[PDB]
Design an enzyme around this catalytic site. Structure first.
Site, mmCIF file in Angstrom:
data_model
loop_
_atom_site.group_PDB
_atom_site.id
_atom_site.type_symbol
_atom_site.label_atom_id
_atom_site.label_comp_id
_atom_site.label_asym_id
_atom_site.label_seq_id
_atom_site.Cartn_x
_atom_site.Cartn_y
_atom_site.Cartn_z
ATOM 1 N N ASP A 162 0.868 -1.168 -0.046
ATOM 2 C CA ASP A 162 -0.014 0.289 0.169
ATOM 3 C C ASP A 162 0.750 1.419 0.095
ATOM 4 O OD1 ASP A 162 -2.957 1.158 1.828
ATOM 5 O OD2 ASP A 162 -1.859 1.859 0.119
ATOM 6 N N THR A 163 1.065 1.925 -1.306
ATOM 7 C CA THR A 163 1.665 3.182 -1.417
ATOM 8 C C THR A 163 1.082 4.204 -0.639
ATOM 9 O OG1 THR A 163 0.715 3.454 -3.382
ATOM 10 C CG2 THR A 163 2.630 2.226 -3.366
ATOM 11 N N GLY A 164 -0.174 4.312 -0.221
ATOM 12 C CA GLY A 164 -0.909 5.295 0.317
ATOM 13 C C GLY A 164 -0.755 5.388 2.048
#
Ligand SMILES: CC[C@H](C)CN(C[C@@H](O)[C@H](Cc1ccccc1)NC(=O)c1cccc(O)c1)S(=O)(=O)c1ccc2ncsc2c1
EC number: 3.4.23.16
Lengths: 99, 99
Positions: free
Chosen positions: A25-27
């Site tokens: 999850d880059t967020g």
């Protein structure tokens, strides 16, 4: 490897002898794991997302294996609906976004 | 481009002739923008995140240029903590995870 995003980027992670599926999850600034009774010291924290905040327990220097790659760092444990591998560990396994 | 993850993957987007900053968010199924005006019909929708569920307005077939790459798709507008580009548009611009 290369992971396309047609579906959720779930991968197998290992923390102690629990194997779990978790989102790359880059967020996510931090790594957030489903409720589990990890050994050692921790600190309370509140993290915010869509819908509001949840309360988590911050454990430091926890080794975690992600698709065979070794990581070690802070993991937040709490009532998340999904295991989330955040940027703190994504960098350690050499993960980039590409387009 | 190749984007590393030691910092938040924030990019400039263009939507309705307006420039905004948005987070490339592989853990998000949907693209969700903070309160704004968009033209046309929308549908009330509910989505769930780490903190629970929120109400959003669903706009379909909206052009967004993300870091110079054109997408046309669904944009949800509501009380997200930050503008996020989710998998529905990440796939359109050919974004993948690599490590
Ligand atoms: C602020 C930007 C986003 C919304 C932060 N969130 C990461 C984001 O990818 C989260 C991850 C997630 C997936 C599924 C269920 C719960 C949560 N995704 C979503 O909120 C999401 C998911 C599906 C559809 C959708 O429209 C949105 S997070 O709330 O999960 C999060 C994760 C790590 C973290 N570390 C410090 S604050 C913090 C917040």
């Amino acid at each position: 490897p290369q992971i396309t995003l047609w579906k959720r980027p779930l991968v197998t992670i290992r923390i102690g002898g629990q194997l779990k599926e978790a989102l790359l999850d880059t967020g996510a600034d931090d790594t957030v794991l489903e409720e589990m009774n990890l050994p050692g010291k921790w600190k309370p924290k509140m993290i915010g997302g869509i819908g509001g905040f949840i309360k988590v327990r911050q454990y430091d220097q926890i080794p975690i294996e992600i698709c065979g790659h070794k990581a070690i760092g802070t993991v937040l444990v709490g009532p998340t609906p999904v295991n989330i591998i955040g940027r703190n560990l994504l960098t350690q396994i050499g993960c980039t976004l590409n387009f």
